Amino acid sequence: TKNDVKITALSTSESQIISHMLRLLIEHDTHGKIKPTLVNNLGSSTIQHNALINGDANISGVRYNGTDLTGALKEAPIKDPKKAMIATQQGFKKKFDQTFFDSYGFANTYAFMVTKETAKKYHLETVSDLAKHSKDLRLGMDSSWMNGDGYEGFKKEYGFDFGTVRPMQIGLVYDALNTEKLDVALGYSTDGRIAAYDLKVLKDDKQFFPPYAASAVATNELLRQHPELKTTINKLTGKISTSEMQRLNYEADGKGKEPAVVAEEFLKKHHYFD
Length: 274
Hints:
Elements: E1 6-10, H1 13-29, E2 37-42, H2 45-54, E3 59-64, H3 65-70, H4 81-96, E4 98-100, E5 110-114, H5 116-122, E6 138-142, H6 151-158, E7 164-168, H7 173-178, E8 184-188, H8 192-196, E9 200-201, E10 214-219, H9 220-225, H10 228-234, H11 242-253, H12 259-269
Parallel strand pairs: 1-2, 1-3, 6-7, 6-8
Antiparallel strand pairs: 3-10, 4-10, 5-8, 5-9
Helix pairs in contact: 1-12
């Protein structure tokens, strides 16, 4: 139709890519009648949430369900993917009059990861596959993770521990793995370096971590004013696998492209999902 759309974005390339993708897709579907702008460089999803609640914006480009379920919704974590998403969507509707969309198709979670040579050597697919070997392996993790859903809880849940642990900056675990300073890293599952270095992300077979499925959020006030936008936003539902988000992040962080350029190239490649 024609009116006022503002999309919150974090300072992460991931948020900026998907926020620009929504901006461009809305421009496309509305033939320039709606030209959204970004409320960019926000520090956290608390800041994103507060913007929507305060009327400072009406779309969040990307929100993660496990974050918003225990954060904004103030609820207990749910481990099962389907029931966690249902609880998140019901909560956003009833507490905040917002639609938390079905997922883009990726999750951005802490995940254990190894190089391709290490995954081959030890036949690794799941976190449990590490059990026999972990005593001889070097683990790198974010320093904030040393401390009930950190390393102690993981050791209790999974039933094994590592020969060496190295608490460090999460941003540096990918290169430390690539350079063989680590054998295993607890990294973020969509980091572009997973694509750049062909790293193998292991399945959390015991669901030690809750889901962090990524979705758009829009206020229902906006969706009531412009019903067409719900159809627009839903065009992206399921269209970005975890592997694809890794690739897109690589385009921005490894190849140095603007998130707006990465978003547009992706949209053109898929004919704007028309």
